[PDB]
Short mmCIF file of C-alpha atoms (C1' of nucleotides) in Angstrom, two decimals:
data_model
loop_
_atom_site.label_atom_id
_atom_site.label_comp_id
_atom_site.label_asym_id
_atom_site.label_seq_id
_atom_site.Cartn_x
_atom_site.Cartn_y
_atom_site.Cartn_z
CA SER A 1 33.43 32.13 4.73
CA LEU A 2 30.34 30.51 2.77
CA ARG A 3 28.01 31.67 5.77
CA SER A 4 29.54 35.21 5.63
CA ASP A 5 29.56 35.43 2.06
CA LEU A 6 25.97 34.51 1.85
CA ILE A 7 25.06 36.83 4.69
CA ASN A 8 26.65 39.81 2.71
CA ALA A 9 24.96 38.86 -0.51
CA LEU A 10 21.61 38.56 1.35
CA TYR A 11 22.00 42.02 2.96
CA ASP A 12 23.13 43.47 -0.36
CA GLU A 13 20.58 42.05 -2.77
CA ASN A 14 18.05 43.28 -0.19
CA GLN A 15 19.50 46.85 -0.09
CA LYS A 16 19.33 46.85 -3.90
CA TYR A 17 16.30 45.63 -5.27
CA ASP A 18 12.52 45.45 -4.59
CA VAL A 19 10.39 42.89 -6.37
CA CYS A 20 6.94 44.12 -7.69
CA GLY A 21 5.29 41.66 -9.89
CA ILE A 22 4.96 38.40 -11.99
CA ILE A 23 5.77 39.12 -15.67
CA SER A 24 4.40 37.14 -18.61
CA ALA A 25 6.26 35.96 -21.75
CA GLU A 26 4.61 38.81 -23.50
CA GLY A 27 5.75 41.29 -21.46
CA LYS A 28 2.53 41.94 -18.87
CA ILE A 29 3.10 42.49 -15.54
CA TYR A 30 0.68 41.58 -12.77
CA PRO A 31 0.95 43.22 -9.27
CA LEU A 32 1.49 41.22 -6.09
CA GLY A 33 -0.77 40.66 -3.36
CA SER A 34 -0.20 41.81 0.11
CA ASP A 35 -0.07 38.63 2.45
CA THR A 36 2.52 35.82 3.47
CA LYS A 37 1.22 33.48 1.18
CA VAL A 38 2.47 35.74 -1.64
CA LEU A 39 5.27 37.00 0.06
CA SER A 40 6.96 33.91 1.14
CA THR A 41 6.78 32.42 -2.34
CA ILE A 42 8.42 35.90 -3.76
CA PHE A 43 10.95 36.02 -0.89
CA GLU A 44 11.81 32.10 -1.72
CA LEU A 45 12.16 32.64 -5.33
CA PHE A 46 14.18 35.97 -4.73
CA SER A 47 16.87 34.41 -2.79
CA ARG A 48 17.43 31.50 -5.10
CA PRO A 49 19.79 33.14 -7.54
CA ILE A 50 21.78 34.52 -4.43
CA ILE A 51 22.45 31.16 -2.85
CA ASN A 52 23.16 29.25 -6.00
CA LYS A 53 26.05 32.16 -6.71
CA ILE A 54 27.51 32.17 -3.40
CA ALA A 55 27.43 28.38 -3.14
CA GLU A 56 28.95 27.90 -6.53
CA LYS A 57 31.82 30.31 -5.61
CA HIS A 58 32.46 28.03 -2.74
CA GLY A 59 32.48 24.73 -4.44
CA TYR A 60 29.11 23.59 -3.05
CA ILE A 61 26.37 21.86 -5.30
CA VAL A 62 22.72 23.27 -4.58
CA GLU A 63 19.98 20.88 -4.61
CA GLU A 64 15.97 21.86 -4.15
CA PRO A 65 13.75 19.03 -3.03
CA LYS A 66 12.48 16.60 -6.03
CA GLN A 67 9.43 15.81 -3.90
CA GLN A 68 7.14 18.67 -2.46
CA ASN A 69 6.76 18.67 1.36
CA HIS A 70 10.34 17.85 1.84
CA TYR A 71 12.94 19.84 3.62
CA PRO A 72 14.94 21.83 3.29
CA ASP A 73 14.39 24.48 0.56
CA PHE A 74 18.25 24.13 -0.66
CA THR A 75 20.75 21.43 0.11
CA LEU A 76 24.24 22.60 -0.32
CA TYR A 77 27.14 20.05 -0.40
CA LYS A 78 30.69 19.33 -1.86
CA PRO A 79 30.64 15.79 -3.51
CA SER A 80 34.01 15.09 -1.81
CA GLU A 81 32.00 15.51 1.85
CA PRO A 82 28.71 13.86 1.48
CA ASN A 83 28.27 14.16 5.26
CA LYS A 84 28.93 18.04 5.45
CA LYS A 85 25.52 18.99 4.15
CA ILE A 86 24.15 22.30 4.68
CA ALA A 87 20.49 22.90 5.09
CA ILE A 88 18.86 26.25 4.18
CA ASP A 89 15.21 26.92 4.78
CA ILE A 90 13.80 30.34 3.86
CA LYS A 91 11.32 31.61 6.54
CA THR A 92 9.06 34.66 6.15
CA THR A 93 6.85 36.72 8.75
CA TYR A 94 5.25 40.12 9.25
CA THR A 95 5.28 43.34 11.41
CA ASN A 96 2.67 45.89 11.43
CA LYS A 97 5.22 48.42 12.55
CA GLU A 98 8.73 48.68 12.22
CA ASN A 99 9.77 47.81 15.81
CA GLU A 100 7.54 44.92 16.95
CA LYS A 101 8.39 41.44 18.14
CA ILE A 102 8.23 38.97 15.63
CA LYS A 103 8.21 34.89 15.74
CA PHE A 104 8.52 32.42 13.07
CA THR A 105 7.31 28.77 12.47
CA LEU A 106 10.59 26.80 12.58
CA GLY A 107 9.76 23.30 10.68
CA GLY A 108 8.01 20.19 12.02
CA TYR A 109 9.08 18.63 15.64
CA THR A 110 7.60 15.25 14.40
CA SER A 111 9.08 14.78 11.15
CA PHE A 112 12.96 14.51 10.11
CA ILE A 113 14.01 15.44 13.85
CA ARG A 114 12.48 12.44 15.28
CA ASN A 115 12.74 9.86 12.20
CA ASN A 116 16.01 10.41 10.03
CA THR A 117 14.57 9.86 6.63
CA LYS A 118 11.04 11.54 6.84
CA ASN A 119 10.43 14.48 4.90
CA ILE A 120 13.73 15.29 4.03
CA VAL A 121 15.97 15.43 0.86
CA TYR A 122 18.97 13.56 2.48
CA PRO A 123 19.07 11.60 5.78
CA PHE A 124 19.00 14.26 8.62
CA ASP A 125 22.36 12.98 10.00
CA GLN A 126 24.14 13.95 6.90
CA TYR A 127 23.56 17.54 7.55
CA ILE A 128 25.88 19.60 9.79
CA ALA A 129 24.19 22.85 9.59
CA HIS A 130 20.59 24.23 9.46
CA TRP A 131 20.30 27.64 8.57
CA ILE A 132 17.35 29.78 8.38
CA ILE A 133 17.03 32.83 6.00
CA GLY A 134 14.28 34.80 7.59
CA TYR A 135 12.29 37.63 5.87
CA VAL A 136 10.43 40.15 7.81
CA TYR A 137 8.43 42.61 6.09
CA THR A 138 6.08 45.48 7.24
CA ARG A 139 2.64 45.24 6.00
CA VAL A 140 1.30 48.08 3.79
CA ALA A 141 -1.76 49.69 5.55
CA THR A 142 -3.39 49.42 2.22
CA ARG A 143 -5.87 46.62 1.80
CA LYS A 144 -6.77 47.16 -1.75
CA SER A 145 -3.64 46.47 -4.04
CA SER A 146 -3.78 47.36 -7.51
CA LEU A 147 -6.16 45.13 -9.54
CA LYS A 148 -4.99 46.14 -12.95
CA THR A 149 -1.89 44.91 -15.40
CA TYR A 150 1.17 46.68 -16.22
CA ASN A 151 3.82 46.94 -19.01
CA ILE A 152 7.33 47.27 -18.69
CA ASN A 153 7.56 51.02 -19.10
CA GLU A 154 5.32 51.24 -16.06
CA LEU A 155 7.22 49.54 -13.60
CA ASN A 156 7.67 52.22 -11.30
CA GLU A 157 3.94 52.86 -10.91
CA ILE A 158 3.57 49.62 -9.43
CA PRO A 159 2.54 49.51 -6.00
CA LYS A 160 5.00 47.72 -3.46
CA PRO A 161 3.33 45.06 -1.30
CA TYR A 162 5.29 45.88 1.51
CA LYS A 163 6.71 49.15 3.67
CA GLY A 164 10.02 47.78 4.06
CA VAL A 165 11.77 44.37 4.32
CA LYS A 166 14.55 43.21 6.63
CA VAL A 167 16.64 39.78 6.21
CA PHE A 168 18.76 37.84 8.42
CA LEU A 169 20.66 34.45 8.16
CA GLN A 170 20.95 32.38 11.64
CA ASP A 171 21.18 28.70 12.76
CA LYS A 172 17.81 27.23 13.66
CA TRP A 173 18.65 25.98 16.99
CA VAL A 174 19.90 29.51 18.10
CA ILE A 175 16.64 31.27 17.18
CA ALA A 176 14.51 28.04 18.55
CA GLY A 177 11.72 28.83 21.38
CA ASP A 178 10.11 26.52 23.91
CA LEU A 179 6.46 27.09 22.59
CA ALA A 180 5.03 25.18 19.55
CA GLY A 181 4.69 27.45 16.41
CA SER A 182 1.50 25.54 15.40
CA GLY A 183 -0.90 23.30 16.92
CA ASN A 184 -2.22 20.86 14.19
CA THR A 185 0.78 20.93 12.16
CA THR A 186 3.21 20.71 14.95
CA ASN A 187 5.99 22.94 14.12
CA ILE A 188 8.70 24.13 16.39
CA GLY A 189 8.19 27.88 17.63
CA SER A 190 11.03 30.55 17.29
CA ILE A 191 11.54 33.07 19.93
CA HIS A 192 9.40 35.81 20.28
CA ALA A 193 11.62 38.94 20.16
CA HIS A 194 12.68 41.75 17.88
CA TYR A 195 14.79 41.55 14.77
CA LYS A 196 17.82 42.48 16.55
CA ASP A 197 17.69 39.47 18.91
CA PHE A 198 17.48 36.91 15.71
CA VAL A 199 20.61 38.64 14.03
CA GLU A 200 22.28 38.46 17.57
CA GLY A 201 21.26 35.12 18.27
CA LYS A 202 19.70 35.67 21.75
CA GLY A 203 18.04 32.38 21.83
CA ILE A 204 17.01 30.31 25.02
CA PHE A 205 18.70 26.86 24.56
CA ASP A 206 21.96 26.06 25.99
CA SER A 207 23.15 24.23 22.85
CA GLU A 208 21.72 22.44 19.68
CA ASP A 209 21.85 19.07 21.88
CA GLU A 210 19.49 20.77 24.26
CA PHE A 211 17.26 22.43 21.29
CA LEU A 212 17.05 18.96 19.50
CA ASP A 213 16.28 16.91 22.72
CA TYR A 214 13.80 19.31 23.68
CA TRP A 215 11.77 19.45 20.41
CA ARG A 216 12.35 15.55 20.01
CA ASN A 217 10.48 14.96 23.45
CA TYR A 218 7.88 17.74 23.55
CA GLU A 219 4.50 16.24 23.66
CA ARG A 220 1.68 17.48 21.06
CA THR A 221 -1.14 18.77 23.36
CA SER A 222 -1.43 20.89 26.70
CA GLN A 223 -2.79 17.52 28.52
CA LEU A 224 0.10 15.55 27.60
CA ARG A 225 2.62 18.29 28.38
CA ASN A 226 1.17 18.99 31.79
CA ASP A 227 2.64 15.85 32.95
CA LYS A 228 5.96 16.19 31.18
CA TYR A 229 6.92 20.01 30.42
CA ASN A 230 5.45 22.89 28.33
CA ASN A 231 8.63 24.97 28.64
CA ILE A 232 12.43 24.94 28.83
CA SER A 233 12.44 25.23 32.58
CA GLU A 234 9.99 22.43 32.99
CA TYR A 235 12.08 20.19 30.48
CA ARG A 236 15.30 20.89 32.78
CA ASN A 237 13.25 19.67 35.76
CA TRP A 238 12.20 16.84 33.48
CA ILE A 239 15.85 15.87 32.99
CA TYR A 240 16.60 16.28 36.52
CA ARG A 241 13.65 13.71 37.51
CA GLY A 242 15.35 11.13 35.00
CA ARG A 243 13.46 11.85 32.08
CA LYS A 244 10.14 11.02 33.56
CA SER B 1 -23.84 36.12 -17.77
CA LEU B 2 -21.13 36.79 -15.25
CA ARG B 3 -20.15 33.23 -15.04
CA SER B 4 -20.01 32.46 -18.94
CA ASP B 5 -17.87 36.02 -19.44
CA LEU B 6 -15.56 35.27 -16.36
CA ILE B 7 -14.86 31.75 -17.75
CA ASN B 8 -14.30 32.91 -21.27
CA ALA B 9 -11.78 35.46 -20.19
CA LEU B 10 -9.98 32.95 -18.03
CA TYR B 11 -9.91 30.28 -20.86
CA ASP B 12 -8.81 33.02 -23.53
CA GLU B 13 -6.11 34.58 -20.90
CA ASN B 14 -4.71 30.86 -20.29
CA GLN B 15 -4.37 30.07 -23.89
CA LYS B 16 -2.68 33.17 -24.75
CA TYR B 17 -0.34 34.12 -22.04
CA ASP B 18 2.34 32.39 -19.88
CA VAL B 19 3.81 33.59 -16.70
CA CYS B 20 7.84 33.71 -16.53
CA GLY B 21 9.07 35.09 -13.42
CA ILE B 22 9.12 37.78 -10.71
CA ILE B 23 10.22 41.21 -11.91
CA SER B 24 11.93 43.63 -9.58
CA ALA B 25 11.69 47.64 -9.67
CA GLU B 26 15.34 47.45 -11.24
CA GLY B 27 14.05 45.25 -13.98
CA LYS B 28 15.71 42.09 -12.66
CA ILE B 29 13.91 38.96 -13.71
CA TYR B 30 13.78 36.00 -11.29
CA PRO B 31 12.61 32.68 -12.59
CA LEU B 32 9.53 30.56 -11.04
CA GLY B 33 9.84 27.39 -9.11
CA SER B 34 8.27 24.22 -10.02
CA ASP B 35 6.00 23.37 -7.38
CA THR B 36 2.38 24.24 -6.39
CA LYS B 37 2.96 26.68 -3.65
CA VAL B 38 4.79 28.69 -6.09
CA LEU B 39 2.41 28.01 -9.06
CA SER B 40 -0.72 28.36 -6.98
CA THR B 41 0.27 31.82 -5.84
CA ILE B 42 1.03 32.68 -9.43
CA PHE B 43 -2.33 31.58 -10.74
CA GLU B 44 -4.03 33.53 -7.89
CA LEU B 45 -2.16 36.85 -9.00
CA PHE B 46 -2.73 35.86 -12.78
CA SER B 47 -6.45 35.83 -12.27
CA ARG B 48 -6.86 38.96 -10.27
CA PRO B 49 -7.08 41.48 -12.97
CA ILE B 50 -9.62 39.11 -15.02
CA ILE B 51 -11.95 38.77 -12.28
CA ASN B 52 -12.07 42.23 -11.60
CA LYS B 53 -12.48 43.29 -15.04
CA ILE B 54 -15.31 40.97 -15.83
CA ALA B 55 -16.92 41.62 -12.29
CA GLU B 56 -16.86 45.35 -13.12
CA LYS B 57 -18.63 44.90 -16.57
CA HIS B 58 -21.31 43.21 -14.71
CA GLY B 59 -21.72 45.95 -11.96
CA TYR B 60 -20.22 43.93 -9.18
CA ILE B 61 -17.82 44.65 -6.46
CA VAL B 62 -14.62 42.76 -5.95
CA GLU B 63 -13.56 42.39 -2.28
CA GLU B 64 -10.55 40.46 -1.14
CA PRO B 65 -10.15 39.10 2.68
CA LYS B 66 -8.82 42.05 4.78
CA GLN B 67 -7.42 39.20 7.45
CA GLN B 68 -5.22 36.43 6.04
CA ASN B 69 -6.70 33.16 7.26
CA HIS B 70 -10.13 33.93 5.18
CA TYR B 71 -12.10 32.49 2.64
CA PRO B 72 -12.78 33.49 -0.17
CA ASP B 73 -10.12 34.52 -2.10
CA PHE B 74 -12.48 37.05 -3.93
CA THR B 75 -16.14 37.98 -3.10
CA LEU B 76 -18.33 39.60 -5.83
CA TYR B 77 -21.52 41.51 -5.02
CA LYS B 78 -23.78 44.27 -6.20
CA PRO B 79 -24.58 47.08 -3.44
CA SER B 80 -28.11 46.35 -4.58
CA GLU B 81 -27.98 42.81 -3.73
CA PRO B 82 -26.24 42.48 -0.55
CA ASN B 83 -27.23 39.21 0.46
CA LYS B 84 -26.48 37.61 -3.08
CA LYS B 85 -22.92 37.41 -2.83
CA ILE B 86 -20.49 35.27 -4.94
CA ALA B 87 -17.58 33.70 -3.36
CA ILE B 88 -14.61 32.77 -5.68
CA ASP B 89 -11.83 30.59 -4.69
CA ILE B 90 -8.73 29.64 -6.94
CA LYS B 91 -7.60 26.09 -6.46
CA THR B 92 -4.21 24.58 -8.26
CA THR B 93 -3.05 21.13 -8.59
CA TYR B 94 -0.51 19.32 -10.84
CA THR B 95 -0.33 16.45 -12.94
CA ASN B 96 2.79 14.31 -13.95
CA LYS B 97 1.64 13.43 -17.46
CA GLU B 98 -0.84 15.50 -19.43
CA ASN B 99 -4.51 14.17 -18.62
CA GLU B 100 -4.13 11.99 -15.38
CA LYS B 101 -6.44 11.97 -12.79
CA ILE B 102 -6.79 15.21 -10.78
CA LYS B 103 -8.21 15.97 -7.34
CA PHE B 104 -8.44 19.39 -5.13
CA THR B 105 -8.53 20.20 -1.74
CA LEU B 106 -12.08 22.44 -1.46
CA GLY B 107 -11.62 24.44 1.57
CA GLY B 108 -12.56 23.23 5.39
CA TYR B 109 -15.38 21.37 6.50
CA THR B 110 -15.25 22.61 9.96
CA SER B 111 -15.34 26.60 9.66
CA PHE B 112 -17.57 28.54 7.71
CA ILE B 113 -19.94 25.67 6.81
CA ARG B 114 -20.50 24.86 10.33
CA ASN B 115 -20.32 28.30 11.75
CA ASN B 116 -21.78 31.26 9.71
CA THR B 117 -18.99 33.84 10.41
CA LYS B 118 -15.79 31.41 10.87
CA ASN B 119 -13.06 32.16 8.81
CA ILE B 120 -15.16 34.01 5.98
CA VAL B 121 -14.91 37.68 4.87
CA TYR B 122 -18.91 37.67 5.17
CA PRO B 123 -21.42 35.51 6.68
CA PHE B 124 -21.86 32.30 5.12
CA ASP B 125 -25.54 32.88 4.62
CA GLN B 126 -24.93 36.19 2.72
CA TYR B 127 -23.64 34.32 -0.38
CA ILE B 128 -25.98 32.63 -2.88
CA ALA B 129 -22.83 30.80 -5.17
CA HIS B 130 -19.63 29.54 -4.15
CA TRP B 131 -17.36 29.06 -7.49
CA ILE B 132 -14.12 27.14 -7.91
CA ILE B 133 -11.65 28.42 -10.49
CA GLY B 134 -9.23 25.54 -10.86
CA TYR B 135 -5.75 25.15 -12.58
CA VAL B 136 -4.18 22.18 -13.23
CA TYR B 137 -0.50 22.25 -14.77
CA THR B 138 1.98 19.76 -15.65
CA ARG B 139 4.91 19.63 -13.76
CA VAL B 140 8.47 20.01 -15.36
CA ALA B 141 11.82 19.74 -13.56
CA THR B 142 13.94 22.59 -12.83
CA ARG B 143 17.30 23.16 -14.76
CA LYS B 144 20.55 25.21 -14.56
CA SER B 145 18.94 28.11 -16.36
CA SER B 146 16.32 28.79 -13.92
CA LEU B 147 18.77 29.58 -11.20
CA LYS B 148 19.93 32.79 -12.65
CA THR B 149 18.43 35.98 -12.87
CA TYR B 150 17.47 37.55 -16.27
CA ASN B 151 17.13 41.06 -17.85
CA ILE B 152 14.00 42.10 -19.66
CA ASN B 153 15.44 41.71 -23.24
CA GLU B 154 15.87 37.75 -22.39
CA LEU B 155 12.16 37.28 -21.47
CA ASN B 156 11.44 34.55 -23.91
CA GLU B 157 14.55 32.64 -22.74
CA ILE B 158 13.42 32.03 -19.44
CA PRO B 159 12.53 28.20 -18.66
CA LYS B 160 8.87 27.94 -17.82
CA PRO B 161 8.56 25.68 -14.77
CA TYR B 162 5.51 23.91 -16.36
CA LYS B 163 3.67 22.35 -19.50
CA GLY B 164 -0.03 22.58 -20.44
CA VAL B 165 -2.10 24.81 -17.80
CA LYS B 166 -5.72 23.79 -18.01
CA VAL B 167 -8.49 25.93 -16.12
CA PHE B 168 -12.15 25.49 -15.36
CA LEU B 169 -14.68 27.40 -13.55
CA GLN B 170 -17.53 25.06 -11.50
CA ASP B 171 -19.44 25.23 -8.42
CA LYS B 172 -18.07 24.08 -5.30
CA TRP B 173 -20.51 21.40 -4.59
CA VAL B 174 -20.72 20.15 -8.16
CA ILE B 175 -17.23 18.87 -8.06
CA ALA B 176 -17.45 18.03 -4.35
CA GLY B 177 -16.41 14.44 -3.65
CA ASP B 178 -17.39 12.43 -0.66
CA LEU B 179 -13.61 11.78 0.71
CA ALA B 180 -11.83 14.29 2.90
CA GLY B 181 -8.98 16.34 0.91
CA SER B 182 -6.86 16.26 3.88
CA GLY B 183 -6.56 15.11 7.48
CA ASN B 184 -5.01 17.36 9.97
CA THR B 185 -6.64 20.16 8.34
CA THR B 186 -10.07 18.69 7.59
CA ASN B 187 -10.55 19.70 4.14
CA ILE B 188 -13.44 19.00 1.62
CA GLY B 189 -12.08 16.69 -1.07
CA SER B 190 -13.01 16.93 -4.51
CA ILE B 191 -13.95 13.95 -6.94
CA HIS B 192 -10.77 12.04 -8.25
CA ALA B 193 -11.21 12.62 -11.83
CA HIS B 194 -10.07 13.83 -15.52
CA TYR B 195 -10.15 17.44 -16.10
CA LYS B 196 -13.42 16.94 -18.38
CA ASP B 197 -15.43 15.58 -15.64
CA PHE B 198 -14.82 18.93 -13.65
CA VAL B 199 -15.60 20.95 -16.70
CA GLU B 200 -18.97 18.88 -17.14
CA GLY B 201 -19.68 18.95 -13.55
CA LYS B 202 -19.65 15.14 -13.13
CA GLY B 203 -19.85 15.12 -9.47
CA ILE B 204 -21.26 12.67 -6.72
CA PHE B 205 -23.74 15.23 -4.89
CA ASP B 206 -27.51 15.39 -6.47
CA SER B 207 -28.01 18.70 -4.69
CA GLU B 208 -25.98 21.51 -3.19
CA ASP B 209 -28.27 20.61 -0.02
CA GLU B 210 -26.87 17.11 -0.05
CA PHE B 211 -23.07 18.61 -0.12
CA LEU B 212 -24.03 20.65 2.70
CA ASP B 213 -25.53 17.90 4.94
CA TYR B 214 -22.78 15.47 4.31
CA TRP B 215 -20.15 17.45 4.83
CA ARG B 216 -21.60 19.33 7.97
CA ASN B 217 -21.96 15.68 9.37
CA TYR B 218 -18.79 13.92 8.06
CA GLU B 219 -16.60 12.88 11.03
CA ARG B 220 -13.17 13.78 11.32
CA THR B 221 -11.58 10.33 11.42
CA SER B 222 -11.76 6.78 10.14
CA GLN B 223 -12.74 5.71 13.79
CA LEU B 224 -15.62 7.84 13.99
CA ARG B 225 -16.50 7.62 10.38
CA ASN B 226 -16.94 3.88 10.81
CA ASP B 227 -20.01 4.12 12.76
CA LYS B 228 -21.44 6.77 10.75
CA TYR B 229 -20.60 7.16 7.20
CA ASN B 230 -17.28 7.01 4.99
CA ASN B 231 -18.70 7.65 1.50
CA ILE B 232 -21.81 8.62 -0.34
CA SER B 233 -23.24 5.13 -0.62
CA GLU B 234 -23.20 5.00 3.36
CA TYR B 235 -24.59 8.57 3.67
CA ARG B 236 -27.49 7.72 1.70
CA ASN B 237 -28.24 4.47 3.68
CA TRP B 238 -27.68 6.51 6.92
CA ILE B 239 -30.30 8.94 5.50
CA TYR B 240 -32.52 6.37 4.53
CA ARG B 241 -32.53 4.96 8.18
CA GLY B 242 -33.49 8.11 9.73
CA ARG B 243 -29.64 9.76 10.17
CA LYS B 244 -28.59 6.83 12.61
"C1'" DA C 1 -0.84 30.15 24.53
"C1'" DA C 2 -3.19 26.14 22.65
"C1'" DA C 3 -5.62 24.81 19.33
"C1'" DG C 4 -7.07 25.10 14.86
"C1'" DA C 5 -7.56 27.87 10.71
"C1'" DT C 6 -5.54 29.24 5.66
"C1'" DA C 7 -3.90 25.97 0.79
"C1'" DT C 8 -2.06 21.29 -1.15
"C1'" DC C 9 0.80 16.96 -1.29
"C1'" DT C 10 2.80 12.18 0.21
"C1'" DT C 11 3.28 7.69 1.42
"C1'" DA D 1 -7.48 6.15 1.80
"C1'" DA D 2 -6.45 8.26 5.92
"C1'" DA D 3 -2.97 10.25 8.16
"C1'" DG D 4 -0.19 13.62 8.76
"C1'" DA D 5 3.55 16.14 6.31
"C1'" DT D 6 4.92 20.95 3.82
"C1'" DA D 7 4.54 27.10 5.38
"C1'" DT D 8 2.34 30.47 8.25
"C1'" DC D 9 -1.52 32.94 10.77
"C1'" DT D 10 -5.22 33.96 14.09
"C1'" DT D 11 -7.77 34.05 18.39
#
DNA sequence: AAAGATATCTT
DNA sequence: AAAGATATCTT
């Protein structure tokens, strides 16, 4: 399927290539910084061609946001089925060592999930799937990346800004957690687990209906949450109480 | 000076070179995206080697943040003048048509400007200067040809995501304005003006002390600013009455 | 964890 | 404009 072909291409492209810099029109190469700010941008751009290739093979149109600050990164759809849209978002996080637990910010919980047309390319109700491409890289110990420029023949001299990169494709709901991913920018939080758990889809929600209801009624602060719910267990008690 | 040389090199490099995409170790080139998240990253990486070169020429050490959530992008200083550090932050914004009015977000007003060691590489009182390297680009919409990978031989064929990049070098306080640059993330707002206004330093503050006093006492919301001050005229009246 | 930092944009 | 969106990290 589209999903299995995209997953396979992602693992293979990741297995084969390693990004190492930005290239100017003159052939001058500038090395990459070591933080997520740089690497999320790079992983996003890296995936573009792959997604586009696999989508075309399945007959899906690929559309990126025309407005900045609009989810998702890629919108896949066939023209004959406008309400069967697939949303693909690319997320990145790091590890200091290969086998440590990670977590992702999975998007706002107050935008398009509470308001159908808020901060989204197409109305939220036209999407039948919300996929997360997650990239997890192990930080290089070095905190002083190259401050010089390179030419095309020196490509293999350019320090790689990561020790290793891992990638996965998974439904948003499946890897969603019950603790916010951010405070002032109110983001859904993912589970806090090993890479394996994301691939395997070992979440905490019983279903997507439950994930969306949880995040749609989650209060923004501790104070407001303390009289309602702060976690999945409290939420299920809240349901039993009659949503009050 | 360090400042004249730095700006001369940035300005020279800007007018001769153009970034095209990310390159891998295997030689595959990946086109760039058309938005500020991508372009801010690129312009940061593009500027790194220039800053290091000019800094080295004046005997200055260049230090980048060891922690991710830390200002500034670059800390310049001679070991003989530890308390005369120079902070450099690179900011980017866009324009839809060459030479429209622009504005930047100039860092928080609730971190290092109110707390000496909050979110800053070195105590704020060790810096005698805070410079902004500002990049302005004219946005260009993505087309089919940016969705595929390119080889080194097609470098010049890759479609650029921007048009007419402009760059300036100025003190933070000089281009600082009197309205917040953002709400929930509480940033100082720059003046809202043409590119030449930034270069020439046509800001609203009369001194750096006034800049700092204004932003140190600026309330976070409209409700709280209603009784204090919302702009420079109100601030100066507040000052005239005795800070009340 | 919760809350608020990092940079910038939209409505 | 003010307010809260876009992604992610720190503490």
